[PDB]
Amino acid sequence: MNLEILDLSILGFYSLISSNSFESIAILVATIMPVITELWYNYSQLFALLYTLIYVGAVVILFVFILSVINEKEEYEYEYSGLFILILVLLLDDLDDNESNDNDYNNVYITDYADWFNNYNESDLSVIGNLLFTEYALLLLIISFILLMSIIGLILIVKKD
Amino acid sequence: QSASTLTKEDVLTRSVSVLRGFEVKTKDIDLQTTFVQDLGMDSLDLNDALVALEEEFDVVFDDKTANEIKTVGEVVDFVLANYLPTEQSINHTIR
């Protein structure tokens, strides 16, 4: 019983009914959490933790910006919607969940055959660091160049003087 | 966006409706209708009408204007010249 379906259905229901900005940043948290958990199992545990390390810090900075901008607008603005139409919209979106139309690729399972040739076994993060600092060191240096531009960019935009 | 959308006829029409909710002497109100004589308003009755007119158009008469206004037409002229829409939040305009 894939419980990931139920969690996404609940998340999608609140996306259509979210009114204030606080409910929107809560939607973002309710989006990263299914991504991290579904990454923690199945595909990649490494990037599930990397998503938590980086995006959670961004969420707090996002949240503290909301406290400086909320201006009573959505605390009294009315919304109409309707319970019946919201469920109908979510039901129709539930009907089609096939992102690809290659039936053979989606219905036939495959296996891999492991080999003992790799006596030197290390984590994927070490291999990423091996290539990032040697093969693609230019990308790493340009990324630091972009980070430098952001630091200068933030100061000039925000600082009054 | 932030600009007046009033007209002399609409302002006069709503000014008459507000003034007809009081115990004025005459229901025939035009630009030249005076508060003191035609409407029979005293000191406090006139100030009640002025504040009531403030609530309708979301404007605030200054002290000098309110202490010297005589006719309804002067009220209409003040509303046209000074009315502005209230500034909205950042989300209302750019979204």
């Binding site: 400086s68 660091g129 091996n130 630091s144 980070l147 630091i151 933030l154 100061i155 925000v158 009054k160 | -």
Partner: protein
């Protein structure tokens, strides 16, 4: 590496948190057993906000100026810098001297932004009010 034991712990932790709330909801005596002031949803004098005794203006959705907003924004580029050091942590030996130099040059670029922040004084707390002494001068004729 088997993580079935870990999964059971995570399940228990989630259930454990609900036990604390469930116990508190089922242990407290009913309002009728207490002074019987009714449900909390009606006791508005209790469910209202706390303002040290005196009620004040209700500013729940008013804007809140933040004097460290630039420090908050500068956190994100520096957080990415620290995160980008993770690949070098577990690959320090394999990259050898070449990766060490690349890792130093990576930090030598971000140190320019660190120097820029030091000179621009962008880390200081911003204040609306300023305290300046005024020299008293006499316009003698």
């Amino acid at each position: 590496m088997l993580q079935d034991l870990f999964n059971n712990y995570v399940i228990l932790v989630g259930i454990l948190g609900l036990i604390f709330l469930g116990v508190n909801y089922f242990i407290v005596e009913s309002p009728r057993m207490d002074e019987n002031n009714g449900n909390i949803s009606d006791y508005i004098e209790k469910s209202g906000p706390f303002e040290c005794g005196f009620s004040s203006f209700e500013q729940s959705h008013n804007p809140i100026p933040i004097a460290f907003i630039l420090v908050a924004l500068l956190f994100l580029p520096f957080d990415l810098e620290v995160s980008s050091m993770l690949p070098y942590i577990v690959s320090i030996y394999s990259v050898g001297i070449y990766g060490l130099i690349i890792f130093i040059l990576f930090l030598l670029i971000l140190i320019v932004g660190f120097i820029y922040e030091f000179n621009t004084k962008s880390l200081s707390i911003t204040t609306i009010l300023h305290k300046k002494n005024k020299a008293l001068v006499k316009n003698l004729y």
